[PDB]
């Protein structure tokens, strides 16, 4: 996944921290979008 | 001879000496750790402030007023020293 930094637009406190909420959602990012995928492939075949 | 009000006057200087010490130790401490709390929690959050002011105020004030009670009992040790004869 190529980081696309956008320029610009209170921050967030993160539990345990940063880097461990990161590594654990990007798999369910992947997962997310593969379900869209598929979502999306469903629609189309009907 | 060792005149006995030099005795009492010298031991009153340090009692008052550690008085204020200890006074200034507590008060340093305890200000700089409430402070060291306020800024973390505006560099959080920028609004915050306003109503972080409001405990942090209130520790200052536990904190300043244990110092100044010492201020006061020193002025008492070295200007009103008890015991004097």
Same mark, same amino acid.
């Given at each position: 996944?190529? =980081?696309?930094?956008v320029?610009? =637009?209170?921050?967030?406190?993160?539990?345990?921290?940063?880097?461990t909420?990161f590594?654990?959602?990007?798999?369910?990012?992947?997962?997310?979008? =593969?379900?869209?995928?598929?979502?999306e492939?469903?629609?189309?075949?009907? | 001879?060792?005149?006995?009000?030099?005795?009492?006057?010298?031991?009153?200087?340090?009692?008052?000496?550690?008085?204020?010490?200890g006074?200034?130790?507590?008060?340093?401490?305890?200000?700089?750790?409430?402070?060291?709390?306020?800024?973390?929690?505006?560099?959080?959050?920028?609004?915050?402030?306003?109503?972080? %002011?409001?405990? %942090?105020?209130?520790? =200052?004030?536990?904190?300043?007023?244990?110092?100044?009670?010492?201020?006061?009992?020193?002025?008492?040790?070295?200007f009103?020293?008890?015991?004097?004869?």
């Amino acid at each position: 996944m190529e =980081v696309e930094y956008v320029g610009e =637009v209170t921050l967030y406190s993160f539990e345990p921290d940063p880097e461990t909420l990161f590594d654990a959602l990007l798999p369910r990012y992947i997962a997310t979008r =593969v379900y869209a995928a598929l979502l999306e492939a469903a629609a189309s075949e009907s | 001879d060792l005149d006995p009000n030099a005795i009492i006057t010298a031991g009153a200087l340090i009692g008052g000496g550690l008085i204020m010490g200890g006074g200034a130790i507590g008060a340093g401490i305890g200000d700089g750790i409430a402070g060291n709390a306020l800024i973390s929690g505006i560099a959080r959050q920028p609004e915050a402030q306003g109503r972080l %002011f409001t405990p %942090f105020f209130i520790t =200052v004030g536990l904190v300043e007023a244990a110092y100044f009670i010492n201020l006061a009992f020193m002025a008492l040790f070295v200007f009103a020293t008890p015991g004097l004869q």
